[PDB]
Amino acid sequence: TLVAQISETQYPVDRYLDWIPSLRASAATAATFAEWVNTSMKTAFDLSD
Amino acid sequence: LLHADTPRLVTWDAGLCTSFKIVPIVPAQVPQDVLAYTFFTSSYAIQSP
Amino acid sequence: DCRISFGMNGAAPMIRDETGLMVPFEGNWIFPLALWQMNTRYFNQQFDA
Amino acid sequence: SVRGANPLMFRANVLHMLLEFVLDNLYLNRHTGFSQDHTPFTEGANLRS
């Protein structure tokens, strides 16, 4: 859901923050964004694996 | 006849694929008493192609 | 395309409009943010006064 | 003389020059790597390193 917001993906989802400027992220750019999402959920639920 | 040298067929290049370059022959006319030095982009250290 | 030309012998400087016209440094203008980011050093010298 | 050449032998020298030109360029281009532009100078282009 989040990656489709900052990239060009055919996933059908309502875009609510299109007035915020951004760029068409590539695979490398999206990977760093995905990494941040990963760690955030791991710390919230206290996961180490 | 027993052993012949094997030629080097496959070689790799990782740079620009060009054989022609542009070189200056006469320096520019900066500064001059007609145009102020703020006009030229070289005064701002802007790199040029 | 916002090229800036200095004026000669008291003539005012001019900048290129989107339609291709040259206009003096006055009036109401509309600028995308990307323009100032590209020419931050040059625009500051010419416009601040 | 060290500053002169025989005019009747220009074609022979030029022909050998052309053969040297071809031999020196017998290489294969290699894929190095890329990165997305973080500046607005291009619309998120991928630039070779």
Provide long-range contacts, Cβ within 8 A and 24+ apart, for D37-46. D39/C37, D40/C34, D40/C37, D40/C38, D41/C38, D43/A23, D43/A24, D44/A23, D44/A24, D44/A25, D44/A26, D46/A26
Cα separations in angstroms, C47 against C25, C36, D24, D30 = 8, 11, 52, 46
Measure the CA–CA gap between C2 and C38, rounded to whole angstroms.
11
Cβ-Cβ contacts under 8 Å, D41 against chain C:
38
Resolution of the experimental model, in Å, one decimal: 3.0
Q: Write down how long chain D is.
A: 49
Omega of the bond leading into B31 within 30 degrees of 0 (cis):
yes
Among A47, B9, A4, C8, CA closest to D26: B9
Q: Which residue has 């694929």 as its token pair?
A: B17
Q: Best mutation site among A7, A8, A23 for testing chain D: the one with the most D CBs within 10 Å? A: A23
- Taking the CA of residue D39 and the nearest CA in chain C, the distance in Å comes to 9
- One-letter amino acid identity for D35? S
- What chain B residue is nearest to C46 in terms of C-alpha separation? B38
The helix (run of H) or strand (run of E) holding residue A38 is helix A27-44
Cα–Cα distance, D21 to D15 (Å, whole number) = 10
The residues facing C22 across adjacent strands are: C16
